[PDB]
Design a protein around this nucleic acid. Sequence first.
RNA 1: UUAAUUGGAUUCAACGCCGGGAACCUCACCGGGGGCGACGGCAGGAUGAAGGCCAGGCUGAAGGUCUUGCCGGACGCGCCGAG
Lengths: 69, 100, 49, 122, 55, 124
Amino acid sequence: PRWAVNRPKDYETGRDLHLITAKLDMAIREDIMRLRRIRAYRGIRHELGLPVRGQRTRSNFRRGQTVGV
Amino acid sequence: QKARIKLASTNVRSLEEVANQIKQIAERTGVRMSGPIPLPTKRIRIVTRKSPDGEGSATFDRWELRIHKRLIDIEADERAMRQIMRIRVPEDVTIEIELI
Amino acid sequence: GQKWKLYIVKDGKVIRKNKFCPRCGPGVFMADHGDRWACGRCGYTEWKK
Amino acid sequence: AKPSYVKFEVPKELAEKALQAVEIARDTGKIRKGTNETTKAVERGQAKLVIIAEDVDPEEIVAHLPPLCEEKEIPYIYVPSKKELGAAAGIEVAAASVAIIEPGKARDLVEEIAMKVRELMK
Amino acid sequence: AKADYNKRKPRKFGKGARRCIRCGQYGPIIRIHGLMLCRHCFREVAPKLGFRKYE
Amino acid sequence: KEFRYRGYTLEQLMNMSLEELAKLLPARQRRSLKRGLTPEQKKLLRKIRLAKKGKYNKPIRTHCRDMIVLPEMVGLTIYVHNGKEFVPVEIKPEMIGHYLGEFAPTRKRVQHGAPGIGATRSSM
RNA sequence: UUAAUUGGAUUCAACGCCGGGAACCUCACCGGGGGCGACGGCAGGAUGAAGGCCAGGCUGAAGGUCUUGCCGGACGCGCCGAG
Ligand SMILES: [Mg+2]
Ligand SMILES: [Mg+2]
Ligand SMILES: [Mg+2]
Ligand SMILES: [Zn+2]
């Protein structure tokens, strides 16, 4: 069924495709690159390495070292 | 040929007084009466925080309002129907009459 | 100031230069847009001449 | 209208009937001062008692009532002064045209003075 | 006109659609069984309405 | 290496009814279009069509952050309010189907300083 | 850190607490635009005060204001107290 493939309604051709291995990787990379070219909000979030789907960041998502006072 | 009577109140004594008046009216004539049936009580419970501010331990009030009910079935007879229509309830009792 | 002029009224004859709205009676006067009969209060897309 | 416009003479009786019979009329009637307000009324005949004082210059906005007198019945009289005409009916300003409709208990004098003005000059 | 710049919009939902009928506060309104009272106002008028603290 | 959106060139997208275009957009855009446009969006669209026709030689400024980018808006520059000022956005073909507000950030990037007194337990 | 990230509470007895799960409203914060002075008095005002509008500019959008002139008849924040 068409509702089972991992890339329905392709952005370029309009068809229902299923990608595996390298093709999948480069398709995802191209999607993120397109978001970055137009300077969209999600593209900026991808560049800065920050959460993209609207999470709060004051408490969690901490990956670093404690700073001294 | 039978009439159904519903009563409700927040005061249990007035309910019984009105029901007893009806029972005496029915006995005072030749007429059959389906006895006063007790229906389940309505409880309205509301829980609120006490303090106006948000400081201090949290404590609560549990307020409650109780509504009692009765049900009476009696056959419609003009001699007795007028008498039960002439009885006037205290201000805290609701009464409704219907024909079935 | 005073706004009552531009009406051709001679010594004995009163005739109004600006017509009144067909919705109302005589006396209420239109503007002088020239492209359409502005009418002030009704307004008409007629392309007056 | 204005004194520098010789229409006819200035009888005392007309002024007596015109200035002294609106105080008895104001208390039982409605008042419409102003030339522009009255002009539409008199064109539409809404005017009933058109009293015109001679105080308004130039001969621009006063030059409508006489040429319109023939268009309607327009029972009208002339007022000598403007100072107390508003005191007769209205507010304490200078008024030129105090047109009223259906005054109370002012019928015989008004009808007589209207007939006199009708037979005097039109 | 000029009074149009003083009127509020007629909201049908949200916190702005309900006020206490005794003090006019927005916020913690008790909606149970059609009451429209603050949690503050209800505490002091409950005995008059017939509620009691049985337990 | 032209532009295509679902197998269509730009021109084929230009000559489309708003309903036909709505079948290509994602679900959120389709529901927003089906439910109609708000009056503010109507005024903005009127200005855009005027500017395309060859009139309105003035910059376009708008408070509508929820307007969806449409193909007929390509090539214009719009100034979108970010809360305190209007920022220019140059509409490119790969922006079809996005809200305008996505291109006008409302917060400034954070560069942290030195933690102050009370930032740790020992500093209190 | 920021244009603003509105405020209260700091041992037990502050920190899923202010019934505080804020898209608008809530809202108190930030950028911008509009509106309001019972009652007394001063200017002024039917030779019309105050007030309202078809079209078009200004504008985020707005008879808000301006352009263009039409509508309404008695009070008056342009000034002083006061509310
Ligand atoms: Mg804080
Ligand atoms: Mg929420
Ligand atoms: Mg808010
Ligand atoms: Zn309350």
